[PDB]
Design a protein around this nucleic acid. Structure first.
Ligand SMILES: [Mg+2]
Ligand SMILES: [Mg+2]
Ligand SMILES: [Mg+2]
Ligand SMILES: [Mg+2]
Ligand SMILES: [Mg+2]
Ligand SMILES: [Mg+2]
Ligand SMILES: [Mg+2]
Ligand SMILES: [Mg+2]
Ligand SMILES: [Mg+2]
Ligand SMILES: [Mg+2]
Ligand SMILES: [Mg+2]
Ligand SMILES: [Mg+2]
Ligand SMILES: [Mg+2]
Ligand SMILES: [Mg+2]
Ligand SMILES: [Mg+2]
Ligand SMILES: [Mg+2]
Ligand SMILES: [Mg+2]
Ligand SMILES: [Mg+2]
Ligand SMILES: [Mg+2]
Ligand SMILES: [Mg+2]
Ligand SMILES: [Mg+2]
Ligand SMILES: [Mg+2]
Ligand SMILES: [Mg+2]
Ligand SMILES: [Mg+2]
Ligand SMILES: [Mg+2]
Ligand SMILES: [Mg+2]
Ligand SMILES: [Mg+2]
Ligand SMILES: [Mg+2]
Lengths: 205, 86, 81, 79
RNA sequence: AAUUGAAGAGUUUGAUCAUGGCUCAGAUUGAACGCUGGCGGCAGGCCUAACACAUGCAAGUCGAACGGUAACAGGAAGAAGCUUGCUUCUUUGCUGACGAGUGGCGGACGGGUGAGUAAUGUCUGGGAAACUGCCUGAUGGAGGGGGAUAACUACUGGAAACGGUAGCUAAUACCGCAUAACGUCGCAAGACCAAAGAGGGGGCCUCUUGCCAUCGGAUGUGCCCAGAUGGGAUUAGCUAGUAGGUGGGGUAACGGCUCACCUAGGCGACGAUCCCUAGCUGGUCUGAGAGGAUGACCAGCCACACUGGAACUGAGACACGGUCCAGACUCCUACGGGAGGCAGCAGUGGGGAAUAUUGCACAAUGGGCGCAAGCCUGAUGCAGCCAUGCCGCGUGUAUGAAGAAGGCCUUCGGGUUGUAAAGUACUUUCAGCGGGGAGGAAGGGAGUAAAGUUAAUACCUUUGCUCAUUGACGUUACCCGCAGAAGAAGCACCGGCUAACUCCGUGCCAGCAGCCGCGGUAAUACGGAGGGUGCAAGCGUUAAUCGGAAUUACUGGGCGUAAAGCGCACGCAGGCGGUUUGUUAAGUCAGAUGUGAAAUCCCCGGGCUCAACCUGGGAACUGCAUCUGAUACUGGCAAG
């Protein structure tokens, strides 16, 4: 129900940084990021169009740490919701509580944010929520519980987030360890490297 | 019967069957008297038998042995037959 | 006869009652004539945990329908017991 | 109004009874073509007024025999 | 706001285009099997033998209808050891009560199953000739008598089951009589028809409740019609109560429902009859849709209750745990004769690829009886078992080059498994252990005060007010502490389709395989390994449905040569119909009204920490009927 294996294999297969490490070091100094894993990694056998769609889907899944059944349900919800299906899917993924905890800088990675959520360190609107997939809505306040404010993990994670592009759809107070989900991100707020139409097409087959 | 109330019900409905059968035989006998008098051609005897029967069918309808519609049917049929006779 | 009673819906350990008008011989969750409200015994604060169509209820009552004890208590409570 | 049906007498060989073919124009549920469909009704004809070929207006009534639950209203146009 | 909706690929050939079948990728399930398996929430769980069933339980209740008193728990009248307290007494329907019995109501519900049924069913919409316990509105009545009969007693028959005889006794059991219309019959005059008491209180009265009649309501049910609802024409004729009429009978009611007579009809290529199969619907799965497939759970309708048949009682049954008969089977027997029906809930055997506990509780909701208290309730609420599904979560999180050891490959340089381990620093969800602790408990019972009733401060009824209490689940949800990464990862695949490649082992063998195919020494296709890919507490396989299949083509295909124009023609039924005017308003179109159950789907919200689940309003239910309009087109009619 969670991927527990080596992390940089996933990035190396996707051929890009999935941000599955804290980012204290460059991912180059920890692995051969330009080479796919395994004995025949250096090879680069032509990828079919199906392969391209599959790899895009897997890359987004692995960024956010979502298994296939949950991800498929996300696609179904995005298709049901009014508007652009791929943008809806990205918005749903960004709304996850573990992802929001990471985006506010409380967790060094999304897996650390997930553990913070799971281990009951996170409050949404003053109430403990330990569900990683909980959907945060606009104007919600996400805070570190008082018992967890002394954790060195969280201070280090806030330091790390200081050295990333700050999301504009959130408002974090690193002193009180509180953040506000102002609005759902638009597509411009998310990376232009994600090609979500490929995921939509994959699931529409 | 396996259930106590079912055994009591069987006894009670047998008792009622005997009671009802006696009453129903009596009422049918009086109706048949009216019909026999009609067939013989005797109006006066037919009317006398009808006057005997009428309270009986009315009372048996009041007691639920027959529906009041059935008593009304017997009265109407016999009256129509008796009147169309002379 | 015609009764006004509670049909037990919802989920296990979390009952939700529909207030129905029914021939009393029918099953509790079966055939009914008209639904005239609901009662949520575990409704949260700010939630409307009871709604009754008192006009329809009075129409059926002035027409011979009896009222179960729970529904009678609910009618009294909609009128501030 | 009174609900009525109009149709062609196809048999009058019964005493006080006739058979009336009622015609309806219905769209086919699959192909969409409007097609003609016939309903045959045993109708009570007191006075034996109707002949084979007349067009009669009929109406529904209580059962009068095993197969009769319709009665004559009038002959709209005679044969 | 509530229709954001539509992908192909492989394979015929030396190659090509087309045609065309086969096959695959998807989604789904009451699944089963193999490998594996941590937790929880919610749901689901005999699809086969409508096979046979051990055992327990699934329908009672009312003493406020009645005679009563078996038992008890006492209040009285009379009684023995030997603790000066005391049993033990013995009696007594006096009292609370209550076994058996009469009586009332229930047992027609609830629950099960899908055998039968292709239309006495079901669905949608109309309808007329009906009955309807309990509930409810109105108006009146509610007098005065009688004969019994259980129980009980005595005797008596039978192994038993079950009876027989005689004598007592009661009623809200039963039956006359009276009374008798706005009831029934009758054109009318007339004639005729009912009933029951019981409880609480009181200086017979009053209150409550029950009883009878009639007409209403409501609910339920019976009946009728039209359209719809599988397959087969290598089933084309079927039918004599048959079709209709008249009269009698019959039913709650119309009706060949039945009978007598008369007429000779009735059904059928718009598919009758016959044969095969089948419970129907809301819906469910699939699909862009139109369709196709389907009817498990949930809800509506129907049918059935060992098999065949029958009626009785009753408001209601031709009656799952009633009666009678017959049959098969099982059992008891003293051999004469008797007993039984899990397709209620558990459960057993059996059949099967396969489907669970002989559990807890009436606390809640509902049902029966009761004035109530309450009793009953395998309905139901829960619990148990099972990864059967859906959903959620965990199995750690940082950091870590020594790019360690081993494995594997190697062109012998190295590459890879690799930040993966280890090491270091953290976090404790869930599981374990301790403590804390909601909500589903609304009522009901006692007193109390007012009314509101009366002769009455009384009974009783409504309100408030006080008291003490009511939870099966249950060691509940949930919350807080404790210890420590500890207790938690597998399954399929890697020739193309199709994401994922190499070495050794084998040598047309062993074997694989959905299709195309692979294997005969240099196999990414067999087998093991290393590496990898996809899913993940599951993963695969099989079965089965729709999709892809525009491959039955309505949407949406073809027929010169690929399969396909009858050898040719005439022609009935049928389909179709030049042009103008009038009329009609059937089709068609517009609006409205009724209906289209709820659930489900969809949209918007709301509740469970989220989700699944639950849930409030909407939309939708594309249909049908009716009414009112429109008149271009189609149809009818009239004139050209
Ligand atoms: Mg899961
Ligand atoms: Mg008929
Ligand atoms: Mg009586
Ligand atoms: Mg009298
Ligand atoms: Mg069958
Ligand atoms: Mg299609
Ligand atoms: Mg079907
Ligand atoms: Mg009867
Ligand atoms: Mg029964
Ligand atoms: Mg049984
Ligand atoms: Mg059973
Ligand atoms: Mg077996
Ligand atoms: Mg019992
Ligand atoms: Mg409580
Ligand atoms: Mg490939
Ligand atoms: Mg080899
Ligand atoms: Mg098709
Ligand atoms: Mg073709
Ligand atoms: Mg040829
Ligand atoms: Mg040819
Ligand atoms: Mg030719
Ligand atoms: Mg010709
Ligand atoms: Mg024309
Ligand atoms: Mg019209
Ligand atoms: Mg609906
Ligand atoms: Mg919410
Ligand atoms: Mg809704
Ligand atoms: Mg015209």
């Amino acid at each position: 129900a969670r991927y527990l294996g080596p992390k940089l294999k996933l990035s190396r297969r996707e051929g890009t940084d999935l941000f599955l490490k804290s980012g204290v070091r460059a991912i180059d100094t920890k692995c051969k990021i330009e080479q796919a894993p395994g004995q025949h990694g250096a090879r680069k056998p032509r990828l079919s169009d199906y392969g391209v769609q599959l790899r895009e889907k897997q890359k987004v899944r692995r960024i956010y740490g979502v298994l296939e059944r949950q991800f498929r349900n996300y696609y179904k919800e995005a298709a049901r919701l009014k508007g652009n299906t791929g943008e809806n899917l990205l918005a749903l993924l960004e709304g996850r509580l573990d992802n929001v905890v990471y985006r506010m800088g409380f967790g060094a990675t999304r897996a650390e944010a997930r553990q913070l959520v799971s281990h009951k360190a996170i409050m949404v609107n003053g109430r403990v929520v330990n569900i990683a997939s909980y959907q945060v809505s606009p104007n919600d306040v996400v805070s570190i519980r008082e018992k967890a404010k002394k954790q060195s993990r969280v201070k280090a994670a806030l330091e790390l987030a200081e050295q990333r592009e700050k999301p504009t759809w959130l408002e974090v107070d690193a002193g009180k360890m509180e953040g506000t989900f102002k609005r759902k991100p638009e597509r411009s707020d998310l990376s232009a490297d994600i090609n979500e139409h490929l995921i939509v097409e994959l699931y529409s087959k | 019967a396996n259930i106590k109330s079912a055994k009591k019900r069987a006894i009670q409905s047998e008792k009622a069957r005997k009671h009802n059968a006696s009453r129903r035989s009596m009422m049918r006998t009086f109706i048949k008297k009216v019909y026999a008098a009609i067939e013989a051609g005797d109006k006066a005897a037919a009317q006398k038998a009808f006057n005997e029967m009428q309270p009986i069918v009315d009372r048996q309808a009041a007691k639920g042995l027959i529906h009041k519609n059935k008593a009304a049917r017997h009265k109407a049929n016999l009256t129509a037959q008796i009147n169309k006779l002379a | 006869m015609v009764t006004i009673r509670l049909a037990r819906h919802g989920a296990k350990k979390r009952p939700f009652y529909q207030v129905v008008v029914a021939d009393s011989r029918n099953a509790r969750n079966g055939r009914f004539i008209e639904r005239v409200g609901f009662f949520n015994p575990i409704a949260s604060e700010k939630e409307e945990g009871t709604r009754l169509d008192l006009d329809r209820i009075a129409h059926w009552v002035g027409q011979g329908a009896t009222i179960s004890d729970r529904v009678a208590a609910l009618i009294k409570e909609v009128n501030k017991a | 109004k009174i609900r009525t049906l109009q149709g062609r007498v196809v048999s009058d060989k019964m005493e006080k009874s006739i058979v009336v073919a009622i015609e309806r124009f219905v769209k086919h549920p699959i192909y969409g073509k409007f097609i003609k469909r016939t309903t045959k009704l045993h109708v009570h004809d007191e006075n034996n007024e109707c002949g084979i070929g007349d067009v009669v207006e009929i109406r529904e009534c209580r059962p009068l025999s095993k197969t009769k639950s319709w009665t004559l209203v009038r002959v709209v146009e005679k044969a």
